[PDB]
Amino acid sequence: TTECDSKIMGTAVKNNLAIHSDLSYWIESRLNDTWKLERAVLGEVKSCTWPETHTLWGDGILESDMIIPVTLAGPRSNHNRRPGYKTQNQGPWDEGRVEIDFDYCPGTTVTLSESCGHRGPATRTTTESGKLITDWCCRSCTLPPLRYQTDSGCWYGMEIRPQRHDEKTLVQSQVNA
Amino acid sequence: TTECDSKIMGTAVKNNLAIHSDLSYWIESRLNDTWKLERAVLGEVKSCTWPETHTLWGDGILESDMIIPVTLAGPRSNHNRRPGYKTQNQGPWDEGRVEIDFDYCPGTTVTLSESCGHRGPATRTTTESGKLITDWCCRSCTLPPLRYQTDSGCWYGMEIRPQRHDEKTLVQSQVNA
């Protein structure tokens, strides 16, 4: 356990946009009906504690609701939330640069259905051979879906699963936070 | 009970300076050995709740430690603190424009002594006739002293009392938060 360097660290909220940022993290939460996470640019994923001194809206937080895990320098902030999503302990955190937003991966769809599997490791939309997986689902997430963008392609949040079970060479996250 | 308008409201921390601000409030906290309140410019004192969405460092706060009372739109933030000072419920809040900083009133001194009286209403350093009260004390405050600046002159925090008891035409705060 340790605390992130606050030397180059800027946290600001103004005009319906809240930002938590440092040298490698840029996290944006916005007000549209309600406040929620909108974008996160993580140059490199790191492991430290985001200092409370630079944390907005940090009263009574549910750690399991923190989209970016608190162990991964995710701000202990209610801005670090999105309805229908829990902490992304099995996101593609080992891919290097990782960008999070809430939007569909190109060529794919996501459907709310009770017939969907549980939260699992984040899955890339393209197989090893580059084949696209088009049909996805989630049990109780909200739309637009949680999306990851790394150097190898586009991924979905833990809540979003491929709804076909004959998917073979699936590329998934192997990390556990 | 109600919440302040966040339309024109900006809260930001960067380079050892944390600011909580809106149309009438400008509150500055800074890092020097530790983080603490440094200046507060209140164009007009108001009564609402500073929204947690725009509050830095709001985990586990002691309301009695909030320099600017939470009932007076004081941010429920640990930035809204100064060591040796409690909530200023009896500050000069009815004087209109009120500026808070931590510095001595001109011509005055403040001494730490156990011989000092309890926290009372904020006292102006000049009497009704304009006579200056030079000698002040506090039981357990820290220096530099909490200072108020209004249109009628310079005041001290509740902790700081005149150490002479023959002070007659004393000008004090009559408000109770």
UniProtKB/TrEMBL annotation, chains A, B:
It comes from the Viruses. It comes from West Nile virus (WNV). The chain holds residues 967 to 1143 of 3433 of the full protein. Interacts with Serine protease/Helicase NS3. Interacts with NS1. Involved in immune evasion, pathogenesis and viral replication. Once cleaved off the polyprotein, is targeted to three destinations: the viral replication cycle, the plasma membrane and the extracellular compartment. Essential for viral replication. Required for formation of the replication complex and recruitment of other non-structural proteins to the ER-derived membrane structures. Excreted as a hexameric lipoparticle that plays a role against host immune response. Antagonizing the complement function. Binds to the host macrophages and dendritic cells. Induces the formation of ER-derived membrane vesicles where the viral replication takes place. Inhibits interferon (IFN)-induced host STAT1 phosphorylation and nuclear translocation, thereby preventing the establishment of cellular antiviral state by blocking the IFN-alpha/beta pathway. Inhibits STAT2 translocation in the nucleus after IFN-alpha treatment. This is Genome polyprotein. It is found in: Host cytoplasm, Host perinuclear region; Host endoplasmic reticulum membrane; Host nucleus; Secreted.
